[PDB]
Amino acid sequence: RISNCVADYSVLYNSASFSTFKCYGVSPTKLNDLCFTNVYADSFVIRGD
Amino acid sequence: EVRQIAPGQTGKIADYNYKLPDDFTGCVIAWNSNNLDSKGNYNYLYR
């Protein structure tokens, strides 16, 4: 859980080290301006297919 | 970037050097050129 901080989504997006980075409810460009209440990052490993 | 070069598609190269309009009408063709450009090719570039 991430809270009580300022997130520079612009840096993360410009730091395009990821192959596929898509949001199904938001547009990546609008992320930097938009603000969120609760942010939860779920990390794991899967297969390409 | 084949996906990136397409209407309503974004990417690192897209929006920086070439961005198709959504309303445009046309065709796009892409293919592998490893054999043709096989020896990197610093003549190729990306800003």
From Swiss-Prot, chain A:
Q: Per the record, which residues fall in region Integrin-binding motif? A: 47-49
Q: What is the effect of changing L12I?
A: In strain: Omicron/XBB.1.5, Omicron/EG.5.1
Q: What is the effect of changing S15L?
A: In strain: Omicron/BA.1
The UniProt function text for this chain reads: Attaches the virion to the cell membrane by interacting with host receptor, initiating the infection. The major receptor is host ACE2. When S2/S2' has been cleaved, binding to the receptor triggers direct fusion at the cell membrane. When S2/S2' has not been cleaved, binding to the receptor results in internalization of the virus by endocytosis using host TFRC and GRM2 and leading to fusion of the virion membrane with the host endosomal membrane. Alternatively, may use NRP1/NRP2 and integrin as entry receptors.
Assembly state and interactors?
Binds to host ACE2. RBD also interacts with the N-linked glycan on 'Asn-90' of ACE2. Cleavage of S generates a polybasic C-terminal sequence on S1 that binds to host Neuropilin-1 (NRP1) and Neuropilin-2 (NRP2) receptors. Interacts with host integrin alpha-5/beta-1 (ITGA5:ITGB1) and with ACE2 in complex with integrin alpha-5/beta-1 (ITGA5:ITGB1). May interact via cytoplasmic c-terminus with M protein. May interact (via N-terminus) with host bilirubin and biliverdin, thereby preventing antibody binding to the SARS-CoV-2 spike NTD via an allosteric mechanism.
Protein name as catalogued = Spike protein S1
| Complete-protein stretch covered | 357 to 405 of 1273
